[PDB]
Amino acid sequence: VDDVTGEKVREAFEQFLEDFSVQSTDTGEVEKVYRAQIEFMKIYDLNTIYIDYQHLSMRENGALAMAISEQYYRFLPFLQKGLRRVVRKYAPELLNTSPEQTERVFQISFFNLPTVHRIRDIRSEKIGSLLSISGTVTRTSEVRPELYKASFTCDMCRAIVDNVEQSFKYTEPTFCPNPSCENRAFWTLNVTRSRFLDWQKVRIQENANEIPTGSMPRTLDVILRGDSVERAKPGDRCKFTGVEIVVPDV
Amino acid sequence: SDEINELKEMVKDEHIYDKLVRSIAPAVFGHEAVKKGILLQMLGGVHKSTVEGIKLRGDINICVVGDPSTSKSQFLKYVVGFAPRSVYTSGKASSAAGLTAA
Amino acid sequence: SEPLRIIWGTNVSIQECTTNFRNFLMSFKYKFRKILDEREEFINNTTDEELYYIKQLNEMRELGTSNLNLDARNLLAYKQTEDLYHQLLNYPQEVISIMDQTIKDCMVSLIVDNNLDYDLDEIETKFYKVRPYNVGSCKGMRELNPNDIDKLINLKGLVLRSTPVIPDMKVAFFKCNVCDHTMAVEIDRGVIQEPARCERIDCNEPNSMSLIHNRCSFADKQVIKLQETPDFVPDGQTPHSISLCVYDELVDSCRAGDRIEVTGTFRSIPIRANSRQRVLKSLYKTYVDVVHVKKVITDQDLAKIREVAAREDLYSLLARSIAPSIYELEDVKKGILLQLFGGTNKTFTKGGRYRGDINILLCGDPSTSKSQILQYVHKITPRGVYTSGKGSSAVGLTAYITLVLESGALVLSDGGVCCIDEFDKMSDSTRSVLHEVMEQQTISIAKAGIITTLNARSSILASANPIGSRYNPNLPVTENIDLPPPLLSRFDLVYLVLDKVDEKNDRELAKHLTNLYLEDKPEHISQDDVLPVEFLTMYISYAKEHIHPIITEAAKTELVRAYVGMRKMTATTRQLESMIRLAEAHAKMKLKNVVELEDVQEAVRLIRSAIKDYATDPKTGKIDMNLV
Amino acid sequence: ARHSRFGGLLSIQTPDKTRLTVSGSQALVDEKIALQKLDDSKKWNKRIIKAAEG
DNA sequence: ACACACTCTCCAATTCTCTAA
DNA sequence: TTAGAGAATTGGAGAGTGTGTTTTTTTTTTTTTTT
Ligand SMILES: Nc1ncnc2c1ncn2[C@@H]1O[C@H](COP(=O)(O)OP(=O)(O)NP(=O)(O)O)[C@@H](O)[C@H]1O
Ligand SMILES: [Mg+2]
Ligand SMILES: [Zn+2]
Ligand SMILES: [Zn+2]
Fold first, then answer.
1. From CA C270, how far away is CA A51, in angstroms rounded?
2. Is A210 helix (H, G, I), strand (E, B) or coil?
3. Is residue A190, in this structure, part of any structural domain at all?
4. Is the CB of C279 under 7 A from strand E?
5. Contact C572, B69 (CB under 8 A)
């Protein structure tokens, strides 16, 4: 079964990356800034791309921006698929990270959203939407490796399982793929073939000047990944953007 | 570029020192001596060490004593409202653990 | 004839409840309620004939809002719903649902029948909810019994604390691991109805579907802790508390120290012995499931307020009406009235913010009725606290580490008045806490694991007796009061009240107090003309919200002159600011937008009168008792 | 409109005075939904038959 | 010993195929 | 064209087996001995 909205969003975001076609800061000449940003990334072997929400707002009567805003968690994989093709088209040197080289895990980033919420304004109706938040940092965790994609091999026979997907808990295969063996136990995680990510936990509390009458400040836990770990510092004031999520009792 | 131009323009002035002293804590009437002291603390001295490895302190500590209604807390309020790295604490409502580390 | 729908275990038919409530909703008019009320004479024939709930529904449509209040007495006024009133109390879960689906259908019917421009899809998308209230007599928290389970209840109390918002699941989302088919499933009775096999025809496989947490749908839940009011506690015992569960609209409504009345179903549930197994305990947990919360305008109100403000005797009228049964003490009453109004709050782009609040100290002889006055202020103010000197610690008065931070008296009292009695009994250690809160109206904290600053826009009203416990005329006034100068400098008004013997005064006082015992429950009152407490509260509240006086140049000249007069001779710089603040409070009380010469002169006069300055020896600082 | 644990209980009486029980708040008002929800609880489905390869 | 999770086994319910009237 | 006799495939009833369980601060109110 296939989601048509995802494919149409994918190949519309593709066209935005191709031909946003803003004119120069000094002259009436088309500049194509996002293609230039891809070239810049190629020059310096970067892994993240920044997009302006105002540029997306004016595109195609705003429907694309609405779909990205209200259903970010559904559409984020399709946005990744859309960007991969464009980088292949104009800068295939960026697709890889001598023996063979694994693929680059690109990160899309957004800024200049219309409004900033307080920690006190987080409510369950907004789960999975795109938001921006501000507060004072009070604690930070050390950087830890998070398992992103896994690969296992069987003890009772020479067989391998690859690209197993994790979500919130450490997860392992359901069968031995070789039908000559039935053992489900004694898997081992191949640290060379599997892939990890950088992960950091930080904790924030409300701005003192914003607290309402007779009340006290609430707090929140925030997750940082990739090239943004250790950017935050205790006692500083920061502004964040991302999506709010819901975490189980593992 | 415009920031550099503005900074150069005020750097060139003959009367810059007096204007700087006069611009600390605008709401407080008089007490130019304390304002001058606050400016010099904010700028600070030069940190250094000797061949022996001993360090020489490069910064300035200040204390203000006064009888009531002398507006002495306004200086602390201005400093904590202005200086980029600063914290305000009350001697009654704080602990040694909360002051250093816990 | 046909199958029927029946509330389980009742033989009540849903058709009758639906039709009766529809008829009530589309034909009730306010005049019927006045028939149940004491007189037909009250009726305004023009207004009271109107279809009240149709008017409300039109407003809901055009204001874009989703909830309808309903006081249950109207169900008794209309003849067709006299029995529905009882059925509501006995079967709330079913009856309330019936009412909801009635209101939504009526809203649709209005736009399609009156053929209006509004989007039908928009109205179909929304949820509409009734919120019944004023159901009957309130019930004591300890007197709820196991025969009240699942019936509607009404409670009064005070709010202790609220937990943060909890996400509550409402719809589950499944996805097939092999073929990527998806299904949305409805949650009822807390159990997820997971499919046995993937429902796509060609992928009919077992264990094939799986849950996706962050594509589910959730709703807000919160728990509020309500405490028993002292009016109901048994003799020689301490108050109890009960927990309220609240959802969606009402979630963040209420703060610590609030005083409320609620309405909700009284529920009970089992609890498990361990998290591994289905074993339940024999005792059941109990709680309340609220559907409405209430705190304990018209052109006629504005007309009354403007007309009262035009009276010549207004200042004396308001002052003698805050505490009607207390004899004389007019200057004390006046100062307290100006504390109630307050100054104006000011904030600059730079140079800070300046307090509008007034601090008052009452000091003098025993039996002078100081503490009796504190009772009136504590009950008049919308928010506030009363406490005693030996009852208070430094932590309890401000804030408490518990890792979480918790509120004390001055924080609960924010925006209100904090009454402190036996002020002379608390230690110098505890009193030193008040310096920062009175000067800045903020509380700074720096302890293990917590460092922050909190707001405290709190007015202090204090009561004390002098050193030696009776005022000694052989010592100067500052030595009789005996507070240290850094703390005595922070009060806007300081009053001396003295137990001076005089036959003229004593006969009047004796006649006043003995007159209260001529009746069982007295109707007698000290004066012919006083305002009711409700209307007086309305006046003060409106004047606080709408009026914001400014300094006139004339007022500036008089303030400078007056300060130099008190100064040249001790008056500190705070005497100037407190004069400004008192003059502003006086201006609000007349509903003026400007401070004038008259207001400045009243502020000066009241300061001179409070500390008996005219009777003070200007050089020795002693008071001539003969001049009092 | 209201949450998943608020729900009351419904009874439906047939001809010949026999009664059934269903839960949830929408069943109180919508008989079509109640009738459909009633049959949906029942466990069995008949198992099924199935052309091309190579 | 008392609820649970998981494995094993046998038996009959079911549909498919062939034959003759 | 119906139907009835025989063979093959599948479901889950239910029986069995193994398993897990009880159980150094830091902050704040109060009493007591010590200078
Ligand atoms: N002017 C008055 N009007 C009304 N009651 C009065 C007056 N003067 C004294 N009383 C009565 O005398 C008693 C005063 O008690 P109280 O309010 O505690 O006075 P106080 O100033 O707080 N004295 P103390 O607590 O000893 O410092 C009460 O019963 C009052 O009703
Ligand atoms: Mg008293
Ligand atoms: Zn194997
Ligand atoms: Zn499937």
1. 53
2. helix
3. yes
4. yes
5. yes
Task: Tell which phi-psi region holds residue A226, choosing left (phi > 0), alpha (psi between -120 and 50) or beta.
Answer: left
CA C374 to ligand 1 center in whole angstroms: 11
Give the length of chain B: 102
Residue B75 CA to residue C404 CA, distance in Å, equals 32
Pick the residue from chain B with its C-alpha nearest to C448: B98
Give the resolution value in Å: 3.5
For tokens 């939407």, the residue is A129
- Count structural domains, chain A: 3
> Could you give the CA distance from residue A236 to residue C74 in angstroms, rounded to a whole number?
57
Q: Are C266 and C284 in contact (CB under 8 A)?
A: no
Partners of A96 in beta bridges: A103
Within a domain: A77: yes
| Rounded (to 5) percent helix, strand, coil in chain D | 25, 20, 55
Quick one: how many helices (H) and strands (E) in chain B? 5, 2
C368 appears as a binding residue in the annotation: yes
Structure tokens at B54: 């001993």
Atom from ligand 1 closest to the CA of residue C329: 1
What technique determined this structure? cryo-EM
Strand F close to C112 by CB, under 7 A: no
Judgement on whether residues A128 and A175 belong to the same structural domain of the protein:
no
Name every chain C residue with its beta carbon within 8 A of the beta carbon of B74.
Answer: 352
Q: What is the CATH number of the domain that holds A233?
A: 2.40.50.140
Which value, in Å, is the radius of gyration of the alpha carbons in chain A? 22
Ligand that lies nearest to the alpha carbon of residue C470, given by its number in the listed order:
1
Indicate the residue type of C350.
K
